[PDB]
Amino acid sequence: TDLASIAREKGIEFFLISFTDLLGVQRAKLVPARAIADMAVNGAGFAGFAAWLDMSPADADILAIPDPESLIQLPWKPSVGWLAADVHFEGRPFPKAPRVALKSVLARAAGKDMHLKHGVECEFFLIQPDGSAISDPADTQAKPCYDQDALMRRFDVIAEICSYMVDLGWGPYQNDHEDANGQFEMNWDYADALVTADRHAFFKFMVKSVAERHGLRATFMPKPFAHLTGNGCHTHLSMWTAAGDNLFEGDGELGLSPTAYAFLGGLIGHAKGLTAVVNPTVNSYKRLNAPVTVSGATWSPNTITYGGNNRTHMVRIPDAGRLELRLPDGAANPYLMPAAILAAGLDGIETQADPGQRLDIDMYVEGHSVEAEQLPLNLLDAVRALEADEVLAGGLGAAAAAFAKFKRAEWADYKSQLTEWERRTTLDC
């Protein structure tokens, strides 16, 4: 059926034709039902220059072509229908647009009968509308993870959103209060990478929208509070044949196949550059200065290492037939992130990359001793690692170079800023 006919059936009065730009910003146009047919076929016009797409004011408008299978009637306002879209420029999918970049990598893998499936653990904070503190002043204890009281104190927003995911058929299965005061997580079933990526982009918008409707605010910022741990976006990954078999399932260590370990080998070999994409902000690189590893230290790995059922590494092996990449944070682009991961993975497969030795230790503690390689310490270094990484850069195409340019400009901006701390500690130098 066409979108126009569905608009009539479901009572949809407007569609949000939406695309994700290089910085993860949701760009959208609100079009009345009477216009969906024309837009569905010809796309909605946007001036790509006004988004983060590294285009020119003199370029022809991009046409964003809605994927009708992505359709989501806003559960809090069903008369509006959300669509994810592919940005086209001059008659071709635009390779700097993240969803397009992802579909390209997916296409290469599918051509080898390898279909990436993933699921995302999107931690977020519920905070005051002005952003200055968490939403619950009573959520204060040192180890608040899974706090029953605080969890239920936010039952209304959490349960409302969860029920929405049930109805949407995402298979939500748990809601938690996470490690930091004010921090939460709502998990749902993994799916085909494109499906999960669309849900991911929609989910952030749904959480922000519902929080705001309850007089609160949600943030997926990696390190919103100086005194608390950060928002991870830990990602679970597996590769499937079209016929429905999990290629990662095998008879090797921990129930993993050689394909799984070669994929993991790409993740390891490509970790430095991968960091730039999945920890994509200046803020992504801040850490509590704590010798005694906080309860939430696990939100982020420090070392290019794996694995085991061990939340202390860059890659965890939770179970047979999957890998968990713990590297990504809450700012990770829903499309660029799976795309860059897949590019690194496929390469590991094609080069039969060796992931090295599994470390069955606590990398936060007994891993000071080990000569494990360290992850990039800031945005600029991660970006340089990305540019120097030919497989990764070539994997993502022109998205990589445009991304790197935006991040360098953010870096320059950042370097003009003063922290209160440096003023306090240097004024009397």
Ligand X SMILES: Nc1ncnc2c1ncn2[C@@H]1O[C@H](COP(=O)(O)OP(=O)(O)O)[C@@H](O)[C@H]1O
Q: At 176, is the secondary structure helix, strand, or coil?
A: strand
Residues 6+ apart with CB under 8 A from 319: 255, 309
Taking CB under 6 A as the criterion, which residues in 297-326 touch ligand X? Answer: 318-319, 321-322
Taking CB under 6 A as the criterion, which residues in 45-64 touch ligand X? Answer: 45
| Min dist. Cβ of residue 328 to ligand X (A) | 13
Does 350 count as an annotated binding residue?
Answer: no
Does 13 count as an annotated binding residue?
Answer: no
Using CB under 6 A, which of 115, 118, 154, 272 touches ligand X? 118
Closer residue to ligand X in complex, CB, 182/232: 232
Spell out the alpha helix ranges (H) of 28-97.
36-42
Residue 118 touches which of a copy of itself, ligand X, none (CB < 5 to 8 A by kind)? ligand X
Residue 281 touches which of a copy of itself, ligand X, none (CB < 5 to 8 A by kind)? a copy of itself
Q: Which residues face 306 on adjacent strands?
A: 315
Residue 67 touches which of a copy of itself, ligand X, none (CB < 5 to 8 A by kind)? none
- Spell out, one character per residue from 104 to 143, where the chain touches a copy of itself: x when CB under 8 A holds, - when not: ---------------------------x---------x-x
* Contact status: 145 vs a copy of itself (CB under 8 A): yes
Closer residue to a copy of itself in complex, CB, 192/362: 362
Taking CB under 6 A as the criterion, which residues in 219-248 touch ligand X? Answer: 236-238, 246
Q: Distance between alpha carbon 28 and the CA centroid of its chain, in Å?
A: 19
Nearest to 364 by CA among 293, 286, 424: 293
Q: Which residues face 185 on adjacent strands?
A: 176
Amino acid identity, position 372? A
Nearest to 231 by CA among 376, 331, 324: 331
Residues 6+ apart with CB under 8 A from 327: 271, 274, 275, 278, 279, 300, 301, 314, 375
**Number of Cβ atoms within 10 Å of the Cβ of 73:** 18
# residues contacting a copy of itself (CB under 8 A): 113
Burial 396-423 (b: 16+ CB within 10 A, else e): bbebbebbbebbeebeeeeeeeeeeeee
Q: Is 207 exposed, middle or buried (0-12, 13-18, 19+ CB in 10 A)?
A: buried
Distance CA 223, CA 221 (A): 6
| Min dist. Cβ of residue 114 to a copy of itself (A) | 28
Q: How many Cα atoms occupy the beta-carbon half-sphere of 165 within 13 Å?
A: 26
Taking CB under 8 A as the criterion, which residues in 394-413 touch a copy of itself? Answer: 410, 412-413
Distances (CA, A) of 182 to 205, 225, 229, 290: 19, 10, 11, 20
Does 187 count as an annotated binding residue?
Answer: yes
Closer residue to a copy of itself in complex, CB, 243/427: 427
Does 234 count as an annotated binding residue?
Answer: yes
Find out whether 118 and 109 touch, Cβ atoms under 8 Å.
Answer: no
Taking CB under 6 A as the criterion, which residues in 277-296 touch ligand X? Answer: none
Closer residue to ligand X in complex, CB, 154/199: 199
Residue 126 touches which of a copy of itself, ligand X, none (CB < 5 to 8 A by kind)? none
Residue 162 touches which of ligand X, a copy of itself, none (CB < 5 to 8 A by kind)? a copy of itself
Name residue, tokens 């006004």. 50
Find out whether 308 and 360 touch, Cβ atoms under 8 Å.
Answer: yes
The residue number whose beta carbon is nearest to ligand X equals 119
Taking CB under 6 A as the criterion, which residues in 155-184 touch ligand X? Answer: none
Does 373 count as an annotated binding residue?
Answer: no
- Spell out, one character per residue from 300 to 329, where the chain touches a copy of itself: x when CB under 8 A holds, - when not: ---------xxxx-----------------
Taking CB under 8 A as the criterion, which residues in 38-57 touch a copy of itself? Answer: 38, 44, 46-47, 49-52, 56-57
| Contact range with a copy of itself by CB under 8 A, out of 238-246, 250-258, 276-284, 394-402 | 276-284
Name residue, tokens 């979108």. 3
The binding site for Mg(2+) comprises: 121, 123, 178, 185, 234, 324
Task: Name the residues that contact ligand X, by CB under 6 A.
Answer: 45, 117-119, 187-190, 236-238, 246, 318-319, 321-322
